[PDB]
Amino acid sequence: DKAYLDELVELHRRLMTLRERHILQQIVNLIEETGHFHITNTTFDFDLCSLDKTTVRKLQSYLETSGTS
């Protein structure tokens, strides 16, 4: 069960440097519709541990973009 956390660390770390606004929009709207978020004065903060199992598979997928061709 120590693997789960890892899935959060890597994502977290990557997200911290991630700039692809194309994804930040997808993810945000994802955890946003859920409600597991807390917006402050002027910023968007969220915890990776607040992700749902079924939502985690969708979270990691976004970053794992690709190209069908």
Binding site: M16, R21, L24, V28, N29, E32, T43, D45, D47, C49
Partner: peptide, 25 residues
């Protein structure tokens, strides 16, 4: 630290919550 907070400038994204219907807790 079973928590990983990630802050994203609202300028970099768009939060859909303009004409909200109702909070209700």
């Amino acid at each position: 630290t079973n928590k990983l907070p990630v802050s994203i400038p609202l300028a970099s994204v768009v939060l859909p919550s303009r004409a909200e219907r109702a909070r209700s807790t």
